[PDB]
Structure formats: structure tokens, C-alpha cells
Amino acid sequence: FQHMASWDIFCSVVDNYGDIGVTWRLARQLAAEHGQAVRLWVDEPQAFARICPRADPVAHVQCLDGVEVRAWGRPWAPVAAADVVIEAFACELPEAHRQAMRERKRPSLWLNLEYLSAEEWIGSCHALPSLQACGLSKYFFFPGFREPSGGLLREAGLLERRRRFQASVSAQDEFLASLGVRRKVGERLISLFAYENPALPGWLEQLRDARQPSLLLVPEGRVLADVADWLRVATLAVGDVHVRDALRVQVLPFMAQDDYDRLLWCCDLNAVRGEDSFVRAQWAGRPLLWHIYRTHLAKLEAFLELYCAGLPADLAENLRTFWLAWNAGGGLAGAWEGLERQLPEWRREAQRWADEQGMRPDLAARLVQFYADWLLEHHHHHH
Ligand SMILES: Cc1cn([C@H]2C[C@H](O)[C@@H](COP(=O)(O)OP(=O)(O)O)O2)c(=O)[nH]c1=O
Numbered sequence: 001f002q003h004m005a006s007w008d009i010f011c012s013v014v015d016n017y018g019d020i021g022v023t024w025r026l027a028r029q030l031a032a033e034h035g036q037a038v039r040l041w042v043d044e045p046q047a048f049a050r051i052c053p054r055a056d057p058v059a060h061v062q063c064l065d066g067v068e069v070r071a072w073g074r075p076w077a078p079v080a081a082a083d084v085v086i087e088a089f090a091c092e093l094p095e096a097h098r099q100a101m102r103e104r105k106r107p108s109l110w111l112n113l114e115y116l117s118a119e120e121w122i123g124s125c126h127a128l129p130s131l132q133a134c135g136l137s138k139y140f141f142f143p144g145f146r147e148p149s150g151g152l153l154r155e156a157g158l159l160e161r162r163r164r165f166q167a168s169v170s171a172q173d174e175f176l177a178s179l180g181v182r183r184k185v186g187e188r189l190i191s192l193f194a195y196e197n198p199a200l201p202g203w204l205e206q207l208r209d210a211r212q213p214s215l216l217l218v219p220e221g222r223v224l225a226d227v228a229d230w231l232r233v234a235t236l237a238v239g240d241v242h243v244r245d246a247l248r249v250q251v252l253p254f255m256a257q258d259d260y261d262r263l264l265w266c267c268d269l270n271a272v273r274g275e276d277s278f279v280r281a282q283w284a285g286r287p288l289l290w291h292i293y294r295t296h297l298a299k300l301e302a303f304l305e306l307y308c309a310g311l312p313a314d315l316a317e318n319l320r321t322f323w324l325a326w327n328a329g330g331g332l333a334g335a336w337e338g339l340e341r342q343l344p345e346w347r348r349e350a351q352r353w354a355d356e357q358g359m360r361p362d363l364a365a366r367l368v369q370f371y372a373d374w375l376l377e378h379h380h381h382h383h
Pocket residue numbers: 015016017018019021022050051193219253254255256257258260273274275276277278
């Protein structure tokens with residue numbers, strides 16, 4: 001015997017990949033690490049196929065890594081509701097599903113999974129119940145970088161695996177070779193995952209004109225047209241390499257989520273965006289550059305306050321200036337010169353940040369614990 005609860009996770013893909021990226025990561029961890037029964041409902045199967053190449057985008061139901069991945073139909077096909085229903089990022093549940101949740105002898109626990117924020121105020125709202133009209137309550141679940149919050153997604157054993165990988169030159173060289181990448185001695189490795197960014201050509205010129213060489217690895221995506229314009233090339237295809245003095249640019253394929261982790265683990269600096277890659281870059285224990293797509297400023301400044309609190313003043317000031325300019329479309333010159341000379345110290349601090357965050361109970365564990373305490377309380381039992 002083993003305790004098993006069922007989970008419905010609802011995901012509406014509006015733009016980009018992090019909403020399915022985060023809910024898929026969570027779904028897989030609930031199934032694989034906690035032995036839960038998980039249904040992940042996705043309204044756009046093509047997005048899911050991008051982050052999970054094993055998936056069949058035309059199938060209405062399929063089982064991947066123990067998760068039952070199901071197409072969110074229009075119109076909605078009525079099904080029974082799980083023990084827990086997660087409404088990710090306020091995507092709005094099907095009406096018939098709310099009826100099914102309330103008809104159960106034990107009504108479904110209804111959670112709203114929120115976007116991640118370092119803003120202090122989310123602590124006052126984490127786990128807040130909200131009575132709905134139908135008589136069910138939902139609970140807001142706010143991931144966060146400090147307590148109280150719902151924590152951060154982090155797989156069992158992740159940092160131990162990351163440390164072993166980064167300690168093995170051969171493991172890194174083998175992984176990079178599988179992408180067609182061969183680092184040169186003394187060449188700094190930078191990954192670029194961003195939105196369209198008018199600050200990019202100014203940074204590329206600084207990488208081109210530097211004393212030390214850089215290899216810029218660009219998974220296919222938005223920013224590639226911007227890079228192609230800066231390179232003055234009409235086409236940029238997977239596998240293409242272009243050299244501009246101290247800067248080498250190489251186009252990567254858009255790879256599976258786990259392979260993208262390994263890329264982040266190889267690089268000396270990871271430019272990332274959104275929500276999931278933002279956190280994966282932190283688990284990589286390496287310098288990072290975060291692109292939020294434009295009321296984004298509150299989240300950016302709040303994270304900088306927390307992330308910079310442990311850095312030396314000069315590193316903190318250059319990091320903040322660069323990140324703000326990176327998200328404001330220009331003004332990177334003085335920031336990058338000063339920031340580049342501090343990358344070794346920043347790397348040591350990034351490792352410490354990852355280790356400290358790694359001591360906090362991870363988000364999936366907190367979610368499973370939330371259900372356990374809620375269930376016991378629902379039956380007026382001790383804990
Ligand atoms: C660059 C890249 C990202 N990803 C994944 C990482 C993340 O889970 C997802 C991107 O989500 P995220 O980082 O939150 O940003 P956005 O919402 O703007 O897309 O895409 C891959 O699976 N392969 C890749 O090659």
C-alpha cells in the first residue's frame with residue numbers, strides 16, 4: 001500500500017513556453033517523486049511538444065513520465081474531478097469541472113498557482129483562502145524566494161547532480177559535443193535566451209571588442225533575428241557559427257527541458273527570461289541575466305534587492321545597472337565593462353545563492369504538504 005492523491009493541473013498557453021514549462025515540471029515531479037496520479041490539461045499541445053520532444057502533439061491523451069497529458073477541449077468534455085485541482089496562473093476552470101469538484105463527497109482542494117515574485121507582500125497572501133460563489137474556496141499559492149511562500153520548484157537531488165556535472169570536464173565536453181559545440185581554451189561560454197531586446201547590439205559590440213573571447217550560444221527562438229541583424233546575415237540556422245573578433249556566435253536547437261539545464265550548467269553566464277529558465281539559471285549556480293517582458297519593474301527591483309543583498313557593493317551596483325538597462329533597452333556599456341571583471345566573484349556568490357535556496361523545502365513538497373494538512377483539517381484531525 002501507498003497513499004496516493006489525484007491532481008488536475010490546468011494550463012492555458014497564452015504566449016511563450018514558461019507557463020507550460022512550469023506546470024509540466026510540477027506535474028512530472030508530483031508523479032515521479034511523490035507517486036501521485038496527475039492529469040495535466042493543456043489548451044495548446046504544440047507548445048508542450050516544444051519543451052517535451054517525446055510528446056505526440058496530435059494525441060488527445062498520452063502518458064509521459066507518469067503524467068496523463070490531456071488536451072483541454074473546446075468544448076470541454078466532462079470528467080470527474082481530482083482530489084486537488086490546480087488552476088495555474090488564473091487560467092479559469094471549465095464550468096463542468098467546478099461542478100464535478102463540488103459534487104465529490106470530499107470536494108476537491110482548489111489551488112491557484114501564482115507567478116513567482118520576490119516582492120515581500122506575497123508572504124501576506126500565500127495560502128490565502130477565497131470563498132467562491134459556488135461555495136468552494138480556492139487557495140492562492142505564491143512561489144517565493146523567502147518565507148512565508150510556496151518556495152521554488154526543485155527536483156530531488158538536483159544540486160548534487162549539478163555539482164557532479166560541473167566537476168566533470170568530460171561530462172560537459174560530451175554534452176556540448178552532442179549540440180555540435182566545442183569550447184576553446186580560455187573562451188567564456190554565454191547562453192542567450194531572451195525576448196526581442198534593443199540593448200542586445202550594444203552588448204554584442206562589447207563582447208566583440210573585448211580582450212577575452214566569448215562563445216555565445218543561442219537556442220533558436222525570438223532573439224535570433226536580432227542576432228542575425230547584428231551579424232548582418234540574412235539567415236541564421238541551427239549549427240551556424242559566426243566569428244566577430246573576440247565573439248563567436250553559434251546557433252543551438254531548441255532542446256528538451258533537461259538538456260537546457262545541462263546547457264545552463266556548462267555556461268559561465270546564462271541570459272534567461274520569463275519564470276522557469278530564470279529559476280533554472282539560479283540552480284545552475286552561475287551568473288545570470290534576466291529578461292522580463294515589459295508593471296514588470298516591481299518584480300525586477302524586488303529580486304535585485306534580495307539577490308544583491310549578499311554581494312559586494314561594487315558587484316551589486318554593476319549587476320543592478322546592467323540588469324535594469326537590459327530590461328530598458330540600452331545603456332549597457334559602463335555596466336558590462338565593470339561587471340565582466342567581477343564574473344569570478346559573482347560566480348562564487350551565485351553558488352552560495354543556489355546552496356542557500358537549496359536548503360529550503362521545494363515547492364512540490366510544499367504543495368503535497370499543503371494537501372496533507374488541508375485534508376487532516378477538513379476531517380478535524382490532529383496533525
Ligand atoms: C531555450 C530553451 C528553453 N526551454 C524551456 C525552459 C523553460 O521551461 C521554457 C521557457 O519558459 P520561461 O523560462 O519561463 O520563459 P518564457 O515564458 O518567456 O518562454 O522553455 C527548453 O525546454 N529548451 C530550450 O532550449
